[PDB]
Amino acid sequence: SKVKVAVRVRPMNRREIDLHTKCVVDVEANKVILNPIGQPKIFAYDHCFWSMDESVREKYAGQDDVFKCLGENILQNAFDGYNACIFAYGQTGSGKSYTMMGTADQPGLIPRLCSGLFERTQKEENEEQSFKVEVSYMEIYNEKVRDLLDPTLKVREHSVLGPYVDGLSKLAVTSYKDIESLMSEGNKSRTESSRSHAVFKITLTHTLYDVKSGTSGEKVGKLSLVDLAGSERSNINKSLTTLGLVISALADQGAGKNKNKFVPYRDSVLTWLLKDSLGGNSKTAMVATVSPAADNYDETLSTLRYADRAKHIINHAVVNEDPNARIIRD
Numbered sequence: 384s385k386v387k388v389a390v391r392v393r394p395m396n397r398r399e400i401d402l403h404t405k406c407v408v409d410v411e412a413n414k415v416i417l418n419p420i421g422q423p424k425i426f427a428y429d430h431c432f433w434s435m436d437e438s439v440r441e442k443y444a445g446q447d448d449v450f451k452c453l454g455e456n457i458l459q460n461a462f463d464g465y466n467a468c469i470f471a472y473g474q475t476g477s478g479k480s481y482t483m484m485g486t487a488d489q490p491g492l493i494p495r496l497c498s499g500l501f502e503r504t505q506k507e508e509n510e511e512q513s514f515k516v517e518v519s520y521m522e523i524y525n526e527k528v529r530d531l532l533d534p535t536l537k538v539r540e541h542s543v544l545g546p547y548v549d550g551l552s553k554l555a556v557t558s559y560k561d562i563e564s565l566m567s568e569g570n571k572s573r574t575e576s577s578r579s580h581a582v583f584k585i586t587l588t589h590t591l592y593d594v595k596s597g598t599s600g601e602k603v604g605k606l607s608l609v610d611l612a613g614s615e616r617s618n619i620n621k622s623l624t625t626l627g628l629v630i631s632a633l634a635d636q637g638a639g640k641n642k643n644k645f646v647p648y649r650d651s652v653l654t655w656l657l658k659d660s661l662g663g664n665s666k667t668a669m670v671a672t673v674s675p676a677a678d679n680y681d682e683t684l685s686t687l688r689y690a691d692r693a694k695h696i697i698n699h700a701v702v703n704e705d706p707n708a709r710i711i712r713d
């Protein structure tokens with residue numbers, strides 16, 4: 384399938400309203416219209432999320448709509464044993480962290496995903512099937528990896544299971560409250576700059592039992608939830624710069640231009656780690672966050688064009704299940 388792309392326009396904030404900064408971003412169904420400060424530029428996406436204002440009610444509905452449209456499907460992907468990824472991309476201040484983690488009063492994608500995961504595993508556990516959940520949480524800053532769950536580490540690409548951070552804590556968790564204290568520990572530990580990338584990973588291992596045979600098999604879904612550094616324009620930006628190159632090359636592939644243009648996955652820590660998320664074995668969505676007002680026109684236009692190329696990336700997601708699991712279905 385193609386990478387799924389959504390644009391989320393955050394509302395005009397207090398400064399932009401106080402100072403009468405012109406709003407240049409309109410949302411029209413699944414299209415974004417960027418008006419000039421000559422002609423309007425129109426971009427089409429899979430979803431567009433918009434907010435009328437920052438009233439408490441519009442905040443509640445905004446986080447809810449994002450989860451309903453993007454989180455439920457990614458959660459279902461993991462219960463089907465797919466690898467899946469949501470990454471948030473856009474300039475500083477545009478709403479990346481608000482979309483992924485949210486706030487205490489307006490929780491975002493990650494807490495909602497974690498809550499729904501344990502509610503479903505608990506509802507669905509029985510004597511024919513059990514679930515194991517593990518989490519990891521890490522940050523890339525200045526091309527170095529740090530374990531946010533540990534009070535440094537290097538990337539390796541496994542021959543079958545893909546790129547991974549070797550030495551990274553991968554913790555078994557049995558309830559939402561367990562994962563919540565880890566999220567809270569990680570979020571406090573995050574370095575506080577717009578130049579760091581944070582990767583939250585959940586591995587869902589579904590074991591199926593054939594009590595007549597005495598056999599069992601595992602189907603494994605993996606969720607990568609990525610809150611990127613701000614897209615606004617050496618070793619400190621290398622990951623972001625290389626992500627742009629990777630997305631542009633892959634978009635060119637997924638249209639016919641350059642069958643084997645060089646996709647520089649290994650030129651940065653971030654793109655090597657997300658190598659399967661982009662063009663590989665993954666159900667992947669991008670959430671491109673943009674600011675609404677005239678003062679960010681060019682950065683918005685850049686984010687919109689990058690999101691527009693991402694939707695041409697072709698992925699190849701297959702179910703990750705061992706031999707027994709496949710047959711135990713029927």
Ligand SMILES: Nc1ncnc2c1ncn2[C@@H]1O[C@H](COP(=O)(O)OP(=O)(O)NP(=O)(O)O)[C@@H](O)[C@H]1O
Pocket residue numbers: 391392393394434437442445473474475476477478479480481482576577611612613614672
């Ligand atoms: N969709 C939204 N609705 C309401 N308020 C929002 C929304 N998006 C962002 N905000 C507000 O704007 C602030 C900035 O958003 P935030 O998610 O922190 O931006 P960011 O893209 O992560 N910046 P950065 O980490 O520096 O690259 C948030 O703390 C919220 O108060």
Ligand SMILES: [Mg+2]
Pocket residue numbers: 464465466467664665666699700701702703
């Ligand atoms: Mg997969």
Ligand SMILES: [Mg+2]
Pocket residue numbers: 479480481610
């Ligand atoms: Mg942020």
